[PDB]
């Protein structure tokens, strides 16, 4: 019915306690980790953690990529950079996605776009969480 | 009197308005601003912002580096990461300065220890914050 989540970064705990289920974006692709779910280990690709605190109640969380690590009991997620989506700002995101859009439409090969490419993820990532905590 | 103050990094506005003055870690060593300051460009180490907000009330930014702009009139001062110092974890600061410290006592050269030496400085820098907050 419940599990333990920790979310930390090497300079904050984002969260810590009983959660009914998250959804990060693991390496593989979007996951929901419920309570009794198998061990794993992750790398965690630029995009967002969806935290359902018990009382079916959300909190969103931007990060810039890190480690999901679900255990018994207990999960983890190690994060690079973590910003709680009521923190972010739109115009400094917005920004981001222009630079990178430019950097784009610059690519003189394709290891240049590539990350652009990655820029431009992370800029997308954030509005989204900007838009999902809104709701 | 007073002077407009922006505090950015790549995704958040950390603080945006009029202040008295303020004290960062230039790259010189400890900075204070104010009002009619003469323009300045400098490189932001490792520590602080105390931002003295009008009526005398302080708020305490750790700043892991950055760049500071002196203009007339604004004042702004780019992050690389920032934490607002009540979202500093005293644990995960504690930590690091363990990690850190036990560096240094492996220190098998003079590059390793300078590297260890950095790590420390910003395990120190963090928790001066979170004491600083406290009060």
Redesign the interface.
Do not use: F, G, K, P
């Given at each position: 019915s419940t599990y333990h989540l920790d979310v930390?970064?090497?300079?904050?705990?984002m969260f810590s306690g009983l959660v009914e289920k998250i959804q990060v974006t693991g390496s593989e692709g979007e996951l929901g980790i419920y309570p009794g779910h198998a061990p794993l280990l992750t790398a965690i690709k630029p995009g967002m953690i969806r935290i359902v605190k018990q009382h079916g109640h959300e909190e969103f969380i931007?990060l810039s990529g890190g480690i999901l690590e679900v255990q018994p009991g207990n999960v983890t997620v190690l994060a690079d950079?973590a910003?709680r989506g009521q923190?972010?700002?739109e115009?400094?995101?917005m920004e981001?996605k222009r630079k990178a859009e430019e950097h784009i439409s610059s690519s003189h090969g394709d290891v240049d776009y590539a990350q652009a490419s990655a820029e431009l993820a992370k800029a997308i990532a954030?509005l989204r969480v900007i838009e999902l905590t809104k709701k």
């Open positions: 930390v970064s090497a300079e904050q705990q931007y950079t910003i923190d972010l700002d115009a400094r995101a981001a954030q």
